[PDB]
């Protein structure tokens, strides 16, 4: 499979999913900083990114988790730029289940980048038999995240009551799955 390269997974001509490396720390930090105000509306971590060392710490932990298959953290490269992150935030090996996460900088939204990334990951991990069940959990009111889940052919399984906390407030989640 020529799309599986040493630097990452080649989705298409424009998109590569990069394996984390410390060299990406600065660009990733600047991307987060540029998107901090908008990101806080949907995710819990951005309020806690204040300096480049927070980016370094994230990369260090991601590399540890990738090494030990606790997670699969990938940096989305669109053309020449890091666009965001797509991940298996949790890999449950015993149950062959992966829980998916994603985010994109504002300047990279509306381009099908995450949908293309997710389709590629499900091909590579699903059709190979490594993962049988893929899961997306997202807050009910998150319009774009719900749209992405459906765009990727996931099926709504239920509503998880008060399951995700942002700023001390618990919100309901939709849980979606794609089963191989
Ligand atoms: C599971 C979780 O992680 S929940 C948390 C999700 N993250 C966040 O909420 C963080 C803040 N938000 C974001 O980062 C983004 O809004 C995301 C990642 C949720 C969605 O970004 P999108 O760019 O909409 O992702 P996606 O890859 O599905 O692209 C679809 C959009 O691109 C357009 N598009 C353009 N080209 C294509 C293409 N080739 N293929 C598919 N769609 C395309 C679609 O029309 C659609 O645009 P629309 O929203 O105007 O209808």
From TrEMBL:
<feature type="binding site">
    <location>
        <position position="104"/>
    </location>
    <ligand>
        <name>CoA</name>
    </ligand>
</feature>
<feature type="binding site">
    <location>
        <position position="102"/>
    </location>
    <ligand>
        <name>CoA</name>
    </ligand>
</feature>
<protein>
    <submittedName>
        <fullName>MccE protein</fullName>
    </submittedName>
</protein>
<feature type="binding site">
    <location>
        <position position="145"/>
    </location>
    <ligand>
        <name>CoA</name>
    </ligand>
</feature>
<feature type="binding site">
    <location>
        <position position="45"/>
    </location>
    <ligand>
        <name>AMP</name>
    </ligand>
</feature>
<feature type="binding site">
    <location>
        <position position="145"/>
    </location>
    <ligand>
        <name>acetyl-CoA</name>
    </ligand>
</feature>
<feature type="binding site">
    <location>
        <position position="42"/>
    </location>
    <ligand>
        <name>CoA</name>
    </ligand>
</feature>
<feature type="binding site">
    <location>
        <position position="114"/>
    </location>
    <ligand>
        <name>CoA</name>
    </ligand>
</feature>
<feature type="binding site">
    <location>
        <position position="138"/>
    </location>
    <ligand>
        <name>CoA</name>
    </ligand>
</feature>
<feature type="binding site">
    <location>
        <position position="142"/>
    </location>
    <ligand>
        <name>acetyl-CoA</name>
    </ligand>
</feature>
<feature type="binding site">
    <location>
        <position position="89"/>
    </location>
    <ligand>
        <name>AMP</name>
    </ligand>
</feature>
<feature type="binding site">
    <location>
        <position position="110"/>
    </location>
    <ligand>
        <name>CoA</name>
    </ligand>
</feature>
<feature type="domain" description="N-acetyltransferase">
    <location>
        <begin position="35"/>
        <end position="176"/>
    </location>
</feature>
<feature type="binding site">
    <location>
        <position position="115"/>
    </location>
    <ligand>
        <name>acetyl-CoA</name>
    </ligand>
</feature>
<feature type="binding site">
    <location>
        <position position="112"/>
    </location>
    <ligand>
        <name>acetyl-CoA</name>
    </ligand>
</feature>
<feature type="binding site">
    <location>
        <position position="102"/>
    </location>
    <ligand>
        <name>acetyl-CoA</name>
    </ligand>
</feature>
<feature type="binding site">
    <location>
        <position position="110"/>
    </location>
    <ligand>
        <name>acetyl-CoA</name>
    </ligand>
</feature>
<feature type="binding site">
    <location>
        <position position="148"/>
    </location>
    <ligand>
        <name>CoA</name>
    </ligand>
</feature>
<feature type="binding site">
    <location>
        <position position="151"/>
    </location>
    <ligand>
        <name>CoA</name>
    </ligand>
</feature>
<feature type="binding site">
    <location>
        <position position="151"/>
    </location>
    <ligand>
        <name>acetyl-CoA</name>
    </ligand>
</feature>
<feature type="binding site">
    <location>
        <position position="112"/>
    </location>
    <ligand>
        <name>CoA</name>
    </ligand>
</feature>
<feature type="binding site">
    <location>
        <position position="148"/>
    </location>
    <ligand>
        <name>acetyl-CoA</name>
    </ligand>
</feature>
<feature type="binding site">
    <location>
        <position position="87"/>
    </location>
    <ligand>
        <name>AMP</name>
    </ligand>
</feature>
<feature type="binding site">
    <location>
        <position position="142"/>
    </location>
    <ligand>
        <name>CoA</name>
    </ligand>
</feature>
<feature type="binding site">
    <location>
        <position position="115"/>
    </location>
    <ligand>
        <name>CoA</name>
    </ligand>
</feature>
<feature type="binding site">
    <location>
        <position position="42"/>
    </location>
    <ligand>
        <name>acetyl-CoA</name>
    </ligand>
</feature>
<feature type="binding site">
    <location>
        <position position="104"/>
    </location>
    <ligand>
        <name>acetyl-CoA</name>
    </ligand>
</feature>
<feature type="binding site">
    <location>
        <position position="114"/>
    </location>
    <ligand>
        <name>acetyl-CoA</name>
    </ligand>
</feature>
């Amino acid at each position: 499979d020529v799309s599986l390269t040493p630097s990452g997974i080649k989705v298409n001509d424009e998109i590569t999913l990069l394996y984390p490396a410390l060299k990406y720390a600065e660009e990733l930090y600047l991307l987060i900083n540029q998107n901090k105000i908008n990101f806080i509306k949907s995710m819990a971590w951005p309020a806690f990114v204040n300096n480049i060392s927070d980016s370094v710490s994230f990369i260090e932990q991601s590399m540890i988790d990738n090494q030990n298959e606790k997670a699969l953290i990938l940096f989305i490269k669109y053309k020449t730029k890091i666009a965001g992150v797509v991940s298996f935030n949790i890999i449950d090996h015993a149950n062959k289940t992966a829980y998916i996460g994603y985010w994109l900088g504002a300047n990279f939204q509306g381009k099908g980048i995450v949908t293309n990334a997710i389709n590629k990951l499900i091909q590579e991990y699903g059709d190979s038999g490594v993962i049988k069940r893929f899961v997306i959990k997202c807050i009910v009111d998150n319009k774009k995240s719900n749209a992405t889940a459906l765009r990727c052919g996931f099926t709504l399984e239920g509503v998880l009551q008060k399951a995700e906390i942002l700023n001390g407030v618990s919100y309901d989640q939709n849980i979606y799955s794609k089963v191989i």
